[PDB]
Amino acid sequence: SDKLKEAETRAEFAERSVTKLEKSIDDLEDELYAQKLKYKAISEELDHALNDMTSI
């Protein structure tokens, strides 16, 4: 009884923790993608500038 109470309790903590972890993971990944897309927009600004520089 002690063993299974312990196991279920720590398992519930594990489930809540892992779900919080998944929210964290998604937020981090989406923020990373947003930042990377901003960077690529900046890169295409630079690439338009380079196309101008094709003047040389």
Partner 1 sequence: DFDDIHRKRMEKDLNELQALIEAHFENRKKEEEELVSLKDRIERRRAERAEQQRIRNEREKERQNR
Q: Which residues bind a copy of itself (CB under 8 A)?
A: 3-4, 7-8, 10-11, 14-15, 17-18, 21-22, 24-25, 28-29, 31-32, 35-36, 38-39, 42
Residue 48 exposure: Cα atoms within 13 Å on the Cβ side: 5
Q: What are 29's two structure tokens?
A: 């990944």
Residue 34 backbone zone (phi > 0: left; psi -120 to 50: alpha; other: beta)? alpha
Decide which of a copy of itself, partner 1, none touches 27; Cβ closer than 5 to 8 Å per partner kind.
none
Decide which of partner 1, a copy of itself, none touches 20; Cβ closer than 5 to 8 Å per partner kind.
none
